[PDB]
Amino acid sequence: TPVLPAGARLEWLLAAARHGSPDSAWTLTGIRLPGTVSAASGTPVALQTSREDSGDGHRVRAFVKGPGTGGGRWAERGGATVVPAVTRPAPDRVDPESLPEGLAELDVAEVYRRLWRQGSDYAEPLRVLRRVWLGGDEAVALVGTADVPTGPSGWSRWAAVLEAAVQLAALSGSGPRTPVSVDRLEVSGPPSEVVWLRVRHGADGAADAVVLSGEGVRLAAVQGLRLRPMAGREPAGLAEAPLERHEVVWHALAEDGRPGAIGGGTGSWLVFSDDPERAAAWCDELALFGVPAVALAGEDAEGRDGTETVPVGTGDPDVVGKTFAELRERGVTVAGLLVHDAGDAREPASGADDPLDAACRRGGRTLALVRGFLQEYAEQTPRIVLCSAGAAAGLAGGPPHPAQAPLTALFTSLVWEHPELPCAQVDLDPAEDPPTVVSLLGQVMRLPGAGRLAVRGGRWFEARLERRPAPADRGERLALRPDATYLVAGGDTRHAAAALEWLAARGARSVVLAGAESERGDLAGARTTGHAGIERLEHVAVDLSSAADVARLAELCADGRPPLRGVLLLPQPVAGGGLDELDGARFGAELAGALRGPVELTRRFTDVGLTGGTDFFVLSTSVVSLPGRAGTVVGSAADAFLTALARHHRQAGLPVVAAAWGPWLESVDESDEAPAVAFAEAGVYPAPGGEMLDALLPLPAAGEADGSGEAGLARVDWDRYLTAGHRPLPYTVLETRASYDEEKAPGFGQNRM
Amino acid sequence: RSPEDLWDLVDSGGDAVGGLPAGRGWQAGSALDGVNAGFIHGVEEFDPYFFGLDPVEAAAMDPQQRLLLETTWEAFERAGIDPVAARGSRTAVYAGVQFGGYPLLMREAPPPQVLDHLGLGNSVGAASGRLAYQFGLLGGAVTVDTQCTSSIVALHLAVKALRNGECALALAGGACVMSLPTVLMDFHRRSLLAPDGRSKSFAAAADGVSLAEGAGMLLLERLSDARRNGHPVMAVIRGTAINQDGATNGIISPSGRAQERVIRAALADGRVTADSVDAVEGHGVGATLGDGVEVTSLLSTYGQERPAGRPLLLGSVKSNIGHTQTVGAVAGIVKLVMALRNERLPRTVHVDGPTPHADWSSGTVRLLTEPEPWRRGERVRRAGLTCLTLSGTNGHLILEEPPADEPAARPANPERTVPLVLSAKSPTALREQAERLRATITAAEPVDVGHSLHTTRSSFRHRAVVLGTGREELAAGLDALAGDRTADGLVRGVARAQGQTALLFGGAGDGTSGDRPADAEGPRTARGLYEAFPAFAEALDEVTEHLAGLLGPEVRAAVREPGPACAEPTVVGQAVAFALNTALHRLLTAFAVRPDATLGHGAGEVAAAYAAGALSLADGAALVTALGRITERVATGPGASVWVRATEDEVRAALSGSQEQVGAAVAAVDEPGTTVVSGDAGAVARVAAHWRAHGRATGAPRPARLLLSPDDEQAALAELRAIVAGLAFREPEVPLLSTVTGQPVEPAELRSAEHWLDHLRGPTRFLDGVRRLRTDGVTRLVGLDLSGDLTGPAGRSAAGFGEPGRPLLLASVPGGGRPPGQALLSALGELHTDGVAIDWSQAFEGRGARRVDLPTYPYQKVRCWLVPPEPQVSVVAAPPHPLLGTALDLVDATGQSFTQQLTPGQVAGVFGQQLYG
Amino acid sequence: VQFGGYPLLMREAPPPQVLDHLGLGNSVGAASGRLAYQFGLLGGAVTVDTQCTSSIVALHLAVKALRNGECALALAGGACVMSLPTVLMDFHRRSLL
Amino acid sequence: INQDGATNGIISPSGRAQERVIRAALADGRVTADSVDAVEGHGVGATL
């Protein structure tokens, strides 16, 4: 969102103050800069100011006022007390070259990146730093030709020069912050083409500053500049981005879907599979094509083609690392790794029907593999291919298999935690024959950086994240049927209270709080706001990990109350963890702990037929899990699994949905905003839970019976999201695939070129 | 958006005048309340990327420049001229345009980028300049203004330029867009508009004029030059005149006399006589007096000379669409052109009865109050335009029928395949053309549609080809393209500009590798090409009837009816393979496929050398038959061969290091994973057993593939040196690579009898040859796969070359598609799709193909305007009381205050009393 | 002739008796129309624009009209007046002068 | 009269177009280029 710079507000007061006089020296004191002056893109602004002279000699009082919000009224946006004609001497020729002596130089490009990681960006007329030095509790800088209209000569250059002092005062801090007050500002003449700034944080929570000419003359001074009382004011209400529906859409590669060449003699390919014959056959195909390769399988299977047997099935990366280290001792050079998953063939092979335990087995194995191998040869910049089967939503080949979900989480974890490595996820059809390995590695090597690809029939698809408007007015028209009960489940009290308030605001007459806290905590406040419209309210104190307590929720609604019509499993926290810090045993334990609750409930309600009698059954997940994020492996895995599980029931005709939401605004902690600060810098903004529920809940009657893919609903700026974190090579989920063969002419009227 | 859309409106008797446009930024208050006019909807939307314009310049351009630019492309497309073929032509341009005031929409000073484009974006004289720049035209390029007559003046000047021989083509028309409301406000303020906005042309109900918008361009040529180039003709403009009302006493009508003069001047210019005109598309703007004067001037000219029983028929399209201002004469032409084609004269709308301000009583002129038939026949059909203006520049044109549209005398044929070819500047515009075209293929002849598409349309970056025999197959292919869903009838892709292409020539005998179910079917498919492609039939017989004399006429039977011998190491097989390779090369070059390098495997090197231009065709057959007889001695010899699934360095080391190797050697090195060994049948079989003991696969046994003795060498060198010395070698047009060396061939090497024997003193090094083609930049790679499946070893050696993940296209020309022509057309369709400039004419040659009309390009339009669209008009409120003025809102004020500035012209309006002056 | 923008000199709105004459007073097509009205001439009257070549183009067409026998005399030329400063400002802003 | 059209600036589009229009004007008038004594060029003062 556009805002008026604090240096421009501080100049605006001075421009009003000096208006009536030719005098070249000034002082302002007791300055206030309340609020933020802002204007949504494409809107008019009206400004007003007054010199409300107190009659106390020097003491003109200056005010500045911003316009009414819509049909509202004028509001103060700055004020200062003037003291003209400063009439005292000051130090002279204070050597500018003596200023940097204690201090280390920084690159101006990193300075403007630091400020961009404080939410703040600047147009070229305010990118006026030229050199910067910093150390301890002070900074100094060289400021460039701040060539504002009436600035090279005339005073308007003070807007830019004062904004540079604010840029340095912010640079020493942390968390997004903006000026609130200045105790004194003292000024003499307009600034020279070159000036030197010094800024010092010696005071308690406040900064002082001096501006010198290129000769070391005192041009201005500032005392008691404060920013901290507007550090961390709500970025959610300030950000430009609307509430929208975000979807991972598979696009066919109809144009340009020809594989092209493979890298030849620049290394060799490691091929791991659950099936020794597959790894063998793909090494044979690579050998026919003259590409050197090695076949690997787990110690669960024999050396059926002289294949390397790898201690995967142990959760430990280090025995796997030692296993590849023997290959490096043979002198092996790696171009890349291909990991091939068996697909649904684990079901007849084991005889089991245990999707959560199957996910725990898969993830545990594959982590030990990928970590163990990265620990040994990541220095070679190896390419990585993770080949799933039947993981992809939104495509032919029947419903996705939820047990595959650890592979997509593991892929996006590599995308954000090892962004130097080019890598891809390929999803095969689980029942068709796999394509030629040359088609895989050829089609993959089209990609610099990273992407998700899928194959069905002879046809190639690429996933793109794309966005469309979200009609919240459907939720205004959704009257929840009055002859019915609704469940709110699993959430903390903050989410529960907001969901309960939304249910009451939508005419829900009967509700059960199926929370663990619900019948043991002080939920009398929740009952009070609920009974503003809920006639019948009940509480369970359910442990969702317990099949018996979940069976108590299934004994409810069967207990003759108004019949069940909606269920909402609310958001839950999940522990942080990257690929580092993690191992396969730890992953299995944490993923099982994360998923057991919503799995056992959704299962039991479907087994007893409360599902499908229900009109709206909703599972919570994060929108962040769509492109994924660094350091959240298990949270991503759980979100992916619930997304697939929801679709498995949806393709069975049931109204189960996984919602991938942004952070709920009511869940932003007032005590420590840091989680929401981290999201806000990453371009994810909180929103009211009731508005997201309004935009979502009536929609399942529309069908979208395949083409929806993975879907979510949030306020996000994907350009901030992509440029936050860090990534050198493109990522085709967020970004357009490539440039292509066209160029442009000099155009009409040009005698040039 | 076309003549047929205007005809559908006019022939159904509709009208198009309506309410004011939304979405133009017009600040207009009640001043236009209840006004109606004929607007173009969506005039603010344009496609900058199609024309190569930057969207900020496209916002700066006057809508009139945009409509001329858009309409000109469409005029070339309906002339059936590729606009890329118009570049560098002596085409002149004459555009009727007026300054529309478009920059005056801005509420605020422009951004510094758009500011620099406003000049050429809005100059009138820049409009014709921008057309001639965009289309690369070299004739004169002028804009003209005479208000309402500006289009008829542009047509007159273009006709006079063509008759004076200044230019080969002329491109004439105009545009009119009300980007600002001011002309409507003025005509409403002065009460000139009819109150319902209808121009009731020549009716007793006449009320006033009615304003409207439009644009149009005609492409014009001298009829003799049009006919000898075979262009379509929509109508003939036969004669033209302009004059001026001037001024006079006004008791004589200046307009009455001036209209009578201009009619006679136009008839004399056309060398026609007034009795031979059937109809006039009159002005008839709907002013009460002017319509009477016009009808009077027709009565005193045409109305005096009528044939018996033939009244002049009068009407005006301004009754259907309003006045249209500067383009009025284009609208009249488009009606008359469509009336000639449909053989009917349309009704005139809103006539209650003929206007009383003229004496209809003679019966020699009547209004078209009902539509009338106008059949082609013995009497040549002709009609006239009038166009008039208050500043007095009048004009008249005479139109005439096209010459007789003589039919093709069209032959009967079997349903040989048709390739439809489509292209667009973006993928969505490709699928739009597939939808538009489906409504045509379901009605027109598929061969005529196909023959039109490859020649009357430009070729862009996004491409598709649809193959079929039946109308239903082509419709199914287009439906799949439109749905963005894959089907085997079609090919999709994007043109790489890079040309670099190479062509691979096989010898006969390598079908001994065992894929004879394909390597016999390739030759049977090549027989099928003789029926489908005339260039193949001619080329094959020009080998066969020329050079079967070297073998006796038995080889002609083998060429006409190929079989297993064509895949086998024999004189007949080698000759047949050379003939069919030569015929395919001549076919592909007739499709304008040009190789940038050639490579030939074994005896196929003679064909590759012939294709590189290094020999005559006769030298080729002499050398091939010599190598054929040498090949017989080898293939009938006591030795054997095998393939092993082991690479050259594996086999060569194991062979050389062991014994039981006696006389076995590496014969070929063509793909990384296998090599071929030949020599003594004992050692050869024992080398194969040795490799099976190492667990490798082997294919075995087969005949020998190398000279088994220096005896055979000395016999072969005696046979070759005599023949090789006689061959008329010359240096190649394009680099020729040899499978003897894996390298390019030098002039002395080409001439060496040793080099030609080294095909038998191997190994063959096809792997190194294909690897060198890719180092040397070859992007796409074509197999003459009549035997040995030559593209297969090419793909397996090419694809593993090296790092960059490069493009690589492999095409097999005598391929596996079931109707024999579809394999070749599919392979060509894939090359054309990837970017080769293929000449499709060979698919349509020797067939009853005619040009037919087609849809025009589907622009992917977006808003381009200097200002955002207005909010809902409910915002407006009453003006301030003139000397009380604006109420202020000084924030802390204790009671309200107001101010006014009166500028000097307002002061004299408010201060309505004078004291002492 | 090229459109000079002359009426854009006004700050106030015009008096109605001026307003009624601004149309034919400033239309480029009307420039050749006035001459043939004032002198009572009966041949075709055309205003042309091609930037700086507008005069030589007007003269070329008049030579063709006389050779074709369209008229007895022809009267060919042009005018250019900087009634507004804006074209000098553009050429000065872009440093073309 | 002619246009200079549009093409690559390296081949001097204005230069070629000026050579064509001179030859066309001579061919219209039936005169020959040796029979001309002087030319009143454009010579506007732009450096190239």
Residue numbers in the entry:
A (entry chain B): 967 to 1719
B (entry chain A): 50 to 966
C (entry chain B): 146 to 242
D (entry chain B): 291 to 338
Which passages does the manuscript contain on this structure?
Here, we present the cryo-EM structure of CalA3, a chain release PKS module without an ACP domain, and its structures with amidation or hydrolysis products. The domain organization reveals a unique “∞”-shaped dimeric architecture with five connected domains. The catalytic region tightly contacts the structural region, resulting in two stabilized chambers with nearly perfect symmetry while the N-terminal docking domain is flexible. The ~360 kDa megaenzyme uses only the KS domain to catalyze one C–N bond formation (or hydrolysis) and subsequently release the polyketide chain.
The substrates (SNAC-N1 and 3-HAA, discussed later) were added into the CalA3 solution for cryo-EM sample preparation. The cryo-EM maps of CalA3 at overall resolutions of 3.38 Å and 4.55 Å were ultimately reconstructed. Although the two substrates were not observed, the resolution of the maps enabled us to reliably assign the individual domains, dissect their linker junctions, and build atomic models of CalA3. The dimeric CalA3 adopts an “∞” shape in both front and back views, with dimensions of approximately 193 × 87 × 116 Å3. CalA3 is composed of two regions: the lower condensing (KS-AT) and the upper modifying (DH-ψKR/KR) regions. Since CalA3 KS does not catalyze Claisen condensation and DH-KR is likely inactive (discussed later), it is more reasonable here to describe them as catalytic (KS-AT) and structural (DH-ψKR/KR) regions. Intriguingly, distinct from the catalytic and structural regions being loosely connected, which was observed in mFAS, LovB, and MAS-like PKS, the structural region of CalA3 substantially contacts the catalytic region, resulting in interfaces that account for nearly 50% of the total buried surface area, with approximately 1421 Å2 on each side, mainly through hydrogen bonding and ionic interactions between the LinkerDH-KR/ψKR and LD-AT domains of opposite chains. We observed two different rotational locations of DD in CalA3. Similarly, the substrate tunnel of the KS monomer traverses through with an open end; however, the two-sided tunnel of the KS dimer is intercepted by the F148 residue pair that forms the aromatic-aromatic interaction with a 4.5 Å distance. The active site residues containing C197, H332, and H372 are conserved, but C197 rotates approximately 143° relative to the same positioned Cys residues in the homologs.
